[PDB]
Amino acid sequence: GSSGSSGHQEIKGRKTLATPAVRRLAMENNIKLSEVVGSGKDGRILKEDILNYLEKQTGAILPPSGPSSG
Structure with a gap:
């Protein structure tokens, strides 16, 4: 055993850079x-990023x- 989690x-980067609607x-x-x-130059998260995150x-x-599978 002696197995551990990477961590x-x-x-x-407290304040996030991205539009309000996004x-x-x-x-x-x-x-x-x-x-x-x-994605945005300044790591600005655009609306596309969201659809790409899901x-x-x-x-x-x-x-x-368990039996559940998805």
Whole structure:
């Protein structure tokens, strides 16, 4: 055994750079802006980023933890 989890860390960047209409698109889809890899030059997260975050979040890697499968 003696198995451990890689771990988790945080990087500066409290204030997010993205339009207001887009900032909400996340709060509605429970999307972590910070996680949403912005596209705009200045890492500005555009509306497209959101639609691109779900397509990736939906097909994530997760265990069976039961009969359920999706």
